[PDB]
Ligand binder design. Structure first.
Ligand SMILES: CCCCCCCCCCCCCCCCCC(=O)OC[C@H](COP(=O)([O-])OCC(O)COP(=O)([O-])OC[C@@H](COC(=O)CCCCCCCCCCCCCCCCC)OC(=O)CCCCCCCCCCCCCCCCC)OC(=O)CCCCCCCCCCCCCCCCC
Ligand SMILES: CCCCCCCCCCCCCCCCCC(=O)O[C@@H](COC(=O)CCCCCCCCCCCCCCC)COP(=O)(O)OCC[N+](C)(C)C
Ligand SMILES: CCCCCCCCCCCCCCCCCC(=O)O[C@@H](COC(=O)CCCCCCCCCCCCCCC)COP(=O)(O)OC[C@H](O)CO
Ligand SMILES: CCCCCCCCCCCCCCCCCCCC(=O)O[C@H](COC(=O)CCCCCCCCCCCCCC)COP(=O)(O)OCCN
Ligand SMILES: CCCCCCCCCCCCCCCCCCCC(=O)O[C@H](COC(=O)CCCCCCCCCCCCCC)COP(=O)(O)OCCN
Ligand SMILES: CCCCCCCCCCCCCCCCCCCC(=O)O[C@H](COC(=O)CCCCCCCCCCCCCC)COP(=O)(O)OCCN
Ligand SMILES: CCCCCCCCCCCCCCCCCC(=O)OC[C@H](COP(=O)(O)O)OC(=O)CCCCCCCCCCCCCCCCC
Ligand SMILES: CCCCCCCCCCCCCCCCCC(=O)OC[C@H](COP(=O)(O)O)OC(=O)CCCCCCCCCCCCCCCCC
Ligand SMILES: CCCCCCCCCCCCCCCCCC(=O)OC[C@H](COP(=O)(O)O)OC(=O)CCCCCCCCCCCCCCCCC
Ligand SMILES: COC1=C(OC)C(=O)C(C/C=C(\C)CC/C=C(\C)CC/C=C(\C)CC/C=C(\C)CCC=C(C)C)=C(C)C1=O
Lengths: 157, 59, 116, 84, 134, 64, 286, 194, 105, 104, 65, 71, 54
């Protein structure tokens, strides 16, 4: 299982790589690679539909908006102190302490867990979304309404 | 103006919107009114399988 | 281990808000439809519907007259408050029919062959 | 046909003009509003379901099955005159 | 992937099963149902082919250096991109509905969902935001 | 026209021969003409049980 | 065996792309009362191969003002996505196969936008955004059409899916307007007539350009196979040829729209129609 | 039976009717919307249950709406009120997260929309900083909710992970030393949103 | 001492923990722009979404999938609003700032 | 340890109609035991009885009508356990081996 | 609901305060419980199965040879 | 719907047979594991072979044959 | 250059794919060791409580 574990571990490398580079274009390219690789990681767990939702939303829709904003707003200033000012050593120390050594992990006292693949059922998801969590579904619709109206009101004229 | 004049001017000036609303309304109305009037209406495993075989064997 | 064979064609009968009560009154209909809810509604419910509609008409006429649009504002505000009152009244009638509220008036009217 | 419609107008000043005023009803080159049910169905079968694209498609399909005007140069030549 | 436990191998003992699984052929009707593994191999093979397409004219083609050969010969997109993002999320929400045999309360909940969608869409239509004059 | 007929015939022949060859190759890989059907969790469980029991029958055969 | 199956799939895809681009030239010529390519090989049957070999020995122009990696990556990404989508058509058994191909075709936007970012042309940046806006606008109508299609796709066990082998083998007569909208959406995705106003490959030469056109024609074949699966009762060679002939026939006889015109068409006509048809089909399916 | 949920259906129907009425009023060129504000206040009263805290919030928001004039601002305040009301009834971290995020998005958009004059860019700047600082706190809430969900197997809010959720709540109240987003907001955003 | 499934699970959890802290800290540490800060916020959301999906598979439970869909919705809405505000601020302040989208300089 | 198994999935689907008409009491006992007791040790005799009753039926069919059962099970194997693609083989097998003992 | 709760006072006072999560899950999903079988029934059933094997009306533990 | 109902009925018939076969195989595997543990820990003081961890409810194995990664 | 950047990315990916599993293996070994110490301490406490608890 070398390639599967390597594909899992690649996501953290791409997460660091998004912020490490000085080119905003390359940051977005790293993010697109990360979301494709994570969609393939989620399908190791047995999720077919939700991995496709990950791909379709984040890579298909949101990264296009990122690339339009970057390509419209970024005159090259990588020399203009993006290289000449460097980075913060305190922030790098915080990242090392919290994410490499992981002094406060999410599993807490536990250190070993057995990964278990699932079997996604979209009938169960449809039943849950439209019967058991229907109020949350409608409130998600209201949040999307806030996004649509708010963007169209905030569009620069 | 009445229903007819306003409807004809609306469908002449913008037909796709009017037809879209009509298709949506036909679906909503069929599920609300038309469907529940005409089309709407412990045995063991052995009786269920016997019924399945009986439905299969004539055709 | 071996899972249950799934029944794709049967959906669970579940409403998203669960009442967590047993009814404390006699049950006429455990699941009334909208016709059942309207046909056993009391007169106080219709009275509060008409009161809400009248208050809505008057207030909409007042507020819509500042932009010279008083009649459609009055009509819209009347319908808006009236449907709020109608939903309240239908819910009250359905709860009396299901047994969660007092239904002595409803038991002596909704069971023509089970009157006494 | 050469008739005009409110909506098929290629610009914006005339699009704004046709949807806020009925000055287009005086002009004789415009198509009139349908008056009954059958005329509404004819107008909708014009706008939806195309049928104006289909006439050009039938003409080009007839041309697909027709004769060709190409000469095979240099095995075949054109036509010239003694004054050339 | 290979199974790492006796329970994952249906309690079949021996060493023939371990080697037979590790050296199995890919089969959609064996151990690899619904597998998405051919999608990765297709990416690798097609990337190899397109790289060979890229590299080859650097060998078998003429080349001449010139300074002129190496030279160049709205907010509506923001609207389109953000609206496409929101509508794609809404269609992704509607997809678990269509993959179920829905009962009537599911239908009316879905129609309330769609109604909120189309109400916001119709507001942006009526304010003249889908007229792409600018 | 008559000049457009050979390319249109060749497209059909290419796709016919390619689909025939791909069908024979995947039929040799899977050994059943329903390998492309949708499978739910019960059908996946049935195929995985069949594979492991076939391996067990092979293991028990090489002992007698 | 998977590598063998994928290569045996890849061979007729490229052979078919060459024959499609020849057949487009010759059918477009026959509608215009001429011949089209006949000299280059007998009956012109070597013309796409000599185009490919001519571009093979053509000089690759690498502009020394662009970013070389993204410039190289854009046609590679387009070609790879087309080949992967074909593999998803023919070498998959997944439950949500149509959703997989919709996800792949939503990724195809990146080659256009990387070409727009990489090359330092003033109007390549101007046209890439227009082409992306067109593809992005018609993807939503494609998705809502898939929603309408999936309401009636059930396998033998009773599970609803988008698996292609479970689709019925008869034409879907109930969804003729949705089929027409699907075909015009295919025309809009491939930037063909009448949406061919936006080009983005103005700086590409030799085999990068060849990769761009192979990707475009392979994507057209993917969408043709998808439409034949969804509406025409199956995937076949005759249906692929007939739908390609229809697309060339439409390209012969029609003029193109302005940018705002097809934007208004896609955002005021096709999306409300597909959503209204989805609501009507959901009402029917109860 | 859905007869115990008529107030939710009434909420949704009222929003659907209010958007259409606001559209019809704007097609006439009305430069004032007091009728829309009265309908918004009626909708606020009609969706609020009969508790002391619920009606305190309702009457407070009815009074607050008299300082807002555009249709979009009224819509954003109503959809922020939905989150504010339903957070008081939240018994999990799912609904807690959604209500908090709806409120944050509404506040950000209102800070962008209502600024005028020379103070427009200052308000947009402070709204951007608030959004960035809010995103990472929302990430902390999601991360430690995922940790709690994995440890307990349920939706109970018990154990060591509640300390970080408490820190999320303290951020939302502007508690020092996580206080500087509110200090930034007070200096630029107009008085009605303050 | 431990099996292949335990290596797979512990590797997943270590990866998502480092992903979460990378998204939280790294773009601020490297003194990047607001656009890259929003991208890193999306990295944080992706780490939480992967954790919820892993737990939903681990417990055979539906709540992780519901949370996954909700996280995708909220993250995209917040990101779109933030990018619109970034564009508006850039057009308001570029006449005197040049490096206007970088507040960590 | 002893090797315990039931026939393959296509054979199980091909013989599933005879299981309820000829081994109903073992099926009932196994269902009731699994409803009452969760530990697999507590339902061992009924589990063993159901396994042996399935295997005895499988031995009966191969003695009486082996070729019809083999072609029907091969048809079910070929078409992914879809019953609607093998109606003729099903009819031939049920004609050769009746589900219930006829003319008794 | 699955994420919201509403609290109202019983007018009569004849309602008992319980955990609403436990009540909600009892109404929504139920609760399955089992018991250990009495050992005497186990040996009785095992003896009956052994007798049915020996007398010849039960088959073998495998379809193979 | 008719085809799905037939397949559901057949799956309901086959499910107890398969669960019984799983149960007997699981018991044999447990017996082999207890023999191995008794061979390993014979000299350890105080160790008990076969100690169930829970008290009331039987615990199924976490991993199973039917759940595998896709890629 | 492009070749330098592709080589550097390939080197970083391979080095990450070989180096991090050693970090994870060391962390899991430390957890196993601490868990075994906890088990032994619990057994010692149980023996002590059996000794003076009857
Ligand atoms: C939806 C979108 C479409 C995609 C889907 C399509 C399907 C796939 C089709 C395949 C794509 C076709 C074309 C490929 C491009 C070919 C390369 C090229 O042209 O040059 C790139 C080129 C490099 O940039 P450049 O123009 O030279 O410089 C401009 C920048 O300003 C310069 O920026 P910079 O100088 O700042 O960056 C330098 C960087 C430059 O990066 C690159 O070179 C690009 C990287 C990705 C390209 C991958 C292509 C092949 C590269 C080799 C891969 C080897 C990996 C291992 C494989 C095994 C081999 C042994 O190199 C480095 O030094 C990397 C440093 C590593 C991170 C350090 C931070 C952590 C430190 C911690 C400790 C360190 C340990 O531009 C791009 O990156 C274009 C991006 C498009 C690539 C495709 C995106 C998707 C990739 C596949 C999916 C991801 C799944 C994960 C699997 C494995 C990962 C890939
Ligand atoms: C990332 C860098 C590339 C990694 C390539 C790799 O991992 O190669 C794979 C995949 O790569 C290939 O096999 C293809 C090589 C690509 C180049 C071929 C050119 C076309 C001929 C090896 O496949 P096998 O283990 O031989 O195949 C397994 C069995 N099965 C056929 C069923 C999939
Ligand atoms: C201009 C506006 C006017 C509005 C008022 C007039 C319109 C009428 C109101 C709409 C219909 C009445 C209200 C709902 C009736 C439910 C009562 C009922 O039982 O009806 C059906 C109940 O079915 C439904 O239609 C349920 C509606 C579900 C609505 C789900 C969404 C609720 C709202 C969620 C919002 C979330 C909260 C947002 C903020 C956080 C089925 O009837 P039955 O049980 O007798 O039939 C049995 C049959 O086999 C089918 O069950
Ligand atoms: C030296 C160390 C190198 C480390 C590299 C780590 C990352 C690996 C990236 C892919 C490498 C491809 C070849 C590796 C083999 C492979 O596919 O491995 C699979 C792991 O999944 C993965 O590796 C998943 C990553 C996939 C990313 C590719 C994205 C393609 C984008 C195209 C769009 C797709 C649209 C959606 C369908 C499982 O292999 P196995 O064990 O099953 O194989 C054998 C049994 N048969
Ligand atoms: C092979 C390739 C096939 C395509 C070849 C022809 C390509 C034509 C491209 C240009 C099409 C123009 C177009 O779609 O125009 C729209 C009308 O047509 C449409 O909207 C057509 C698509 C929908 C078909 C009809 C759908 C409704 C049919 C009846 C439904 C209800 C009864 C049954 C349930 C809107 O143009 P407009 O002028 O109308 O725009 C109103 C505002 N100006
Ligand atoms: C799924 C089906 C999707 C259908 C989409 C329908 C889009 C509706 C947008 C209509 C906006 C155009 C407009 O101005 O509509 C006014 C009212 O329409 C309305 O109020 C129509 C609302 C329809 C709600 C659905 C016409 O009247 P006006 O206000 O312009 O007239 C007096 C001022 N001259
Ligand atoms: C914009 C336009 C949108 C168009 C929408 C079209 C909607 C079409 C609905 C078609 C319904 C299905 C076709 C008939 C099958 C019925 C099945 C059945 O009863 O089976 C028992 C039975 C089968 O016998 P069995 O062997 O006992 O199953 O079939 C019949 O009794 C069918 C008898 C023919 C009835 C034809 C009715 C035609 C009118 C239907 C309604 C049309 C108007 C709806 C909208 C009004 C305005 C809102
Ligand atoms: C067109 C504009 C959008 C329409 C949909 C917007 C709201 C989404 C639907 C909410 C449905 C709530 C329950 C409806 C219901 O139970 O109706 C069955 C019910 C069954 O009929 P009955 O025989 O009278 O019970 O239908 C009705 O009587 C109501 C007709 C449907 C109206 C839906 C919209 C309500 C406000 C206008
Ligand atoms: C000088 C200060 C005057 C403030 C008036 C305090 C009145 C409190 C009434 C509470 C009550 O009766 O409960 C009604 C009711 C609870 O009784 P129920 O009617 O049985 O539900 O709850 C409310 O409507 C509370 C009203 C709160 C008003 C805002 C808070 C104070 C300002
Ligand atoms: C009006 O529309 C059109 C255009 O404008 C959009 C065009 O631009 C072109 C011209 C461009 C072409 C033909 C390039 C795209 C196609 C290619 C490169 C063909 C792909 C074919 C392959 C890979 C197979 C050929 C290779 C073989 C047989 C291998 C040979 C190996 C050995 C002998 C060892 C055409 C024809 C056209 O109609």
């Amino acid at each position: 299982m070398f390639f599967e574990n390597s594909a899992i571990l690649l996501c953290a490398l791409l997460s660091i790589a998004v912020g490490y580079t000085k080119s905003p274009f390359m940051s977005l390219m790293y993010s697109v690679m990360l979301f494709i690789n994570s969609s393939f990681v989620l399908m190791m767990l047995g999720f077919e539909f939700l991995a496709l939702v990950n791909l379709l939303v984040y890579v298909g829709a949101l990264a296009v908006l990122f690339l339009f904003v970057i390509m419209l707003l970024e005159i090259p200033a990588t020399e203009l102190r993006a290289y000449s000012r460097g980075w913060s050593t305190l922030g790098i120390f915080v990242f090392i302490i919290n994410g490499v050594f992981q002094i406060t992990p999410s599993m807490g006292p536990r250190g070993i867990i057995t990964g278990l693949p699932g079997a996604e059922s979209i009938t169960n998801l449809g039943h849950a979304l439209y019967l058991y969590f229907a109020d949350l579904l409608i409130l998600n619709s209201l949040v999307l309404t806030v996004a649509l109206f708010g963007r169209f009101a905030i569009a620069p004229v | 103006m009445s229903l007819g004049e306003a409807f004809r001017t609306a469908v002449y000036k913008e037909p796709v919107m009017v037809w879209s609303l009509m298709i949506y309304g036909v679906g909503i109305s069929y599920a609300a009114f038309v469907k529940p009037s005409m089309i709407e209406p412990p045995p063991s495993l052995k009786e269920v399988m016997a019924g399945i075989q009986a439905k299969l064997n004539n055709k | 281990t071996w899972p249950e064979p799934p029944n794709y064609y049967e959906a669970p009968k579940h409403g998203f808000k669960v009442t967590l009560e047993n009814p404390t009154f006699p049950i006429i209909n455990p699941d009334p439809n909208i016709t059942d809810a309207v046909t056993n509604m009391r007169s106080e419910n219709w009275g509060v519907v008409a009161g809400l509609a009248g208050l809505g008409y008057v207030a909409g006429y007042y507020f819509g007259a500042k932009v010279h649009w008083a009649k459609p504002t009055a009509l819209f505000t009347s319908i808006f408050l009236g449907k709020s009152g109608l939903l309240w009244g239908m819910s009250d009638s359905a709860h009396r029919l299901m047994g969660f509220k007092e239904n002595s008036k409803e038991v002596a009217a909704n069971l023509p062959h089970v009157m006494q | 046909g050469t008739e005009r419609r409110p909506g098929e107008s290629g610009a914006w000043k005339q699009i704004e003009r046709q949807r806020y005023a009925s000055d287009w009803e005086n002009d004789p080159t415009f198509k009139r509003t349908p008056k009954n049910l059958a005329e509404v169905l004819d107008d909708s079968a014009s706008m939806l379901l195309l049928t104006d694209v289909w006439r050009g498609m039938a003409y080009t399909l007839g041309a697909f099955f027709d004769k060709k005007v190409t000469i095979m140069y240099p095995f075949e030549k054109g036509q010239l005159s003694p004054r050339f | 992937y290979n199974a790492w436990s006796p329970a994952q191998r249906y309690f079949v003992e021996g060493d023939h099963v371990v080697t037979a699984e590790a050296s199995r052929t890919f089969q959609f009707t064996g151990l690899d149902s619904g597998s998405f593994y051919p999608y990765v191999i297709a990416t690798v093979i097609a990337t190899a082919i397109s790289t060979v397409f890229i590299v080859a004219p650097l060998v078998i083609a003429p080349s001449r250096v010139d300074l002129d050969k190496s030279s160049a010969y709205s907010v509506s997109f923001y609207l389109v991109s953000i609206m496409y993002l929101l509508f794609d999320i809404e269609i992704a929400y509607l997809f678990p509905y269509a993959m179920t045999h829905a009962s009537l309360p599911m239908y009316w909940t879905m129609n309330l969902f769609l109604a909120i969608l189309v109400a916001g869409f119709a507001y942006e239509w009526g304010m003249g935001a889908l007229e792409w004059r600018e | 026209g008559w000049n457009a007929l050979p390319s249109l015939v060749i497209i059909t022949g290419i796709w016919t021969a390619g689909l025939f060859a791909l069908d024979k190759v995947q039929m040799f890989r899977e050994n059943k003409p329903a390998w492309a059907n949708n499978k739910d969790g019960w059908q996946k469980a049935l195929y995985r049980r069949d594979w492991y029991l076939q391996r067990e029958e092979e293991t028990l055969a090489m002992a007698k | 065996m998977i590598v063998a199956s994928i290569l045996i799939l890849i061979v007729p895809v490229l052979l078919s792309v060459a024959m499609f681009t020849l057949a487009e030239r010759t059918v477009m010529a026959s509608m215009q009362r001429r011949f089209g390519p006949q000299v280059s090989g007998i009956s012109g049957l070597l013309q796409p191969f000599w185009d490919g070999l001519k571009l093979g020995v053509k000089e690759p122009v690498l502009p020394d003002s662009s970013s070389a990696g993204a410039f190289a990556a854009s046609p590679m990404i387009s070609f790879v996505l087309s080949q992967v989508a074909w593999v998803g058509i023919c070498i998959s058994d997944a439950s949500f196969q149509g959703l997989v191909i919709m996800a792949i075709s939503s990724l195809a936007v990146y080659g256009v936008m990387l070409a727009g970012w990489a090359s330092n042309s003033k109007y390549a940046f101007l046209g890439c955004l227009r082409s992306v806006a067109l593809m992005v606008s018609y993807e939503l109508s494609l998705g809502a059409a898939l929603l309408s299609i999936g309401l009636f796709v059930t396998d033998g066990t009773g599970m609803k899916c988008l698996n292609f082998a479970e689709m019925p083998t008869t034409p879907q007569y109930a969804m003729l307007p949705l089929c027409l909208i699907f075909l015009v959406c295919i025309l809009a995705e491939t930037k063909r007539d009448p949406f061919d106003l936006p080009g983005y490959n103005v700086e590409y030469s030799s085999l990068g350009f060849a990769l761009f056109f192979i990707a475009e024609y392979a994507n057209m074949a993917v969408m043709s196979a998808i439409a034949s699966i969804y509406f025409l009762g199956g995937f076949s060679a005759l249906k692929i040829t007939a739908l390609f002939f229809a697309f060339v026939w439409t390209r012969g006889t029609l003029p193109r729209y302005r940018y705002d015109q097809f934007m208004r068409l896609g955002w005021k006509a096709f999306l409300p129609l597909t959503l209204a048809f989805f609501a009507l089909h959901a009402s029917v399916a109860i | 039976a859905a007869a115990a949920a008529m107030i939710e259906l009434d909420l949704c129907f009222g929003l659907l009717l209010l958007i259409l009425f606001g559209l019809l009023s704007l097609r006439n060129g009305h430069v004032s919307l007091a009728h829309i504000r009265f309908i918004c206040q009626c909708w606020l009263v009609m969706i609020t249950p009969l508790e002391v805290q619920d009606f305190a919030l309702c009457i407070l928001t009815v009074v607050l709406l008299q300082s807002f004039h555009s249709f979009e601002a009224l819509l954003f305040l109503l959809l922020a009120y939905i989150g504010q009301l339903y957070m008081m009834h939240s018994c999990n971290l799912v609904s807690f997260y959604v209500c908090l995020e709806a409120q944050t998005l509404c506040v950000v958009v209102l800070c962008g929309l209502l600024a005028r004059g020379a103070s427009t860019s200052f308000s947009v700047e402070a709204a951007l900083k608030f959004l960035l600082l809010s995103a990472m706190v929302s990430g902390m809430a999601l991360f430690w909710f995922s940790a709690m969900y994995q440890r307990t197997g349920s939706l109970d809010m018990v154990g060591q992970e509640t300390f970080w959720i408490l820190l999320v709540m303290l951020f939302k109240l502007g508690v020092a030393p996580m206080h500087m987003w509110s200090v930034d907001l007070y200096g630029s955003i107009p008085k009605s949103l303050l | 001492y431990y099996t292949e499934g335990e290596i797979f699970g512990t590797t997943f959890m270590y990866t998502t923990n480092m992903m979460f802290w990378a998204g939280i800290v790294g773009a601020v540490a490297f003194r990047r722009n607001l656009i890259i800060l929003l991208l890193s916020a999306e990295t944080v959301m992706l780490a939480c979404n992967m954790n919820f999906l892993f737990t939903a598979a681990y417990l055979n439970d539906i709540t992780g999938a519901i949370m996954s869909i909700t996280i995708t919705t909220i993250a995209a809405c917040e990101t779109a609003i933030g990018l619109a505000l970034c564009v508006a601020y850039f057009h308001m302040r570029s006449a005197t700032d040049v490096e206007a989208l970088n507040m960590l300089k | 340890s002893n090797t315990v198994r039931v026939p393959y999935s296509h054979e199980l689907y091909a013989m599933s109609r005879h299981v309820v008409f000829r081994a109903e009491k073992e099926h009932k006992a196994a269902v009731e035991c699994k409803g009452k007791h969760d530990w697999p040790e507590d339902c061992k005799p009924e589990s063993e009885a159901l396994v042996r009753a399935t295997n005895k039926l499988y031995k009966e069919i191969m003695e009486k009508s082996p070729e019809e059962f083999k072609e029907y099970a091969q048809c079910l194997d070929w078409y992914g356990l879809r019953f609607s693609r093998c109606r003729d083989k099903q009819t031939a097998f049920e004609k050769a081996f009746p589900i219930v003992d006829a003319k008794k | 609901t699955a994420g919201f709760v509403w609290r109202e006072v019983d007018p009569t006072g004849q309602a008992k305060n319980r955990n609403h999560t436990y009540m909600y899950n009892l109404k929504t999903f139920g609760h399955r419980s089992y018991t250990r079988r009495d050992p005497s029934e186990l040996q009785a059933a095992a003896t009956s199965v052994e007798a049915r094997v020996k007398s010849g009306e039960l088959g073998g533990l495998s379809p193979l040879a | 719907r008719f085809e799905a109902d037939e397949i559901l009925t057949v799956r309901k018939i086959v499910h107890p047979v398969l669960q019984a076969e799983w149960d007997l195989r699981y018991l044999e595997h447990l017996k082999r594991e207890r023999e191995e543990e008794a061979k390993v820990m014979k000299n350890v003081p105080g160790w008990k072979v076969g100690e169930s961890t829970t008290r009331h409810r039987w615990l199924a194995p976490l991993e199973s044959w039917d759940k595998r990664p896709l890629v | 250059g492009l070749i330098r950047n592709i080589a550097t990315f390939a080197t970083a990916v391979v080095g990450w794919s070989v180096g991090i599993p050693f970090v994870v293996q060391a962390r899991m070994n430390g957890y196993v060791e601490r868990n075994l110490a906890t088990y032994d301490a619990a057994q010692r406490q149980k023996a002590e409580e059996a000794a003076i608890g009857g």
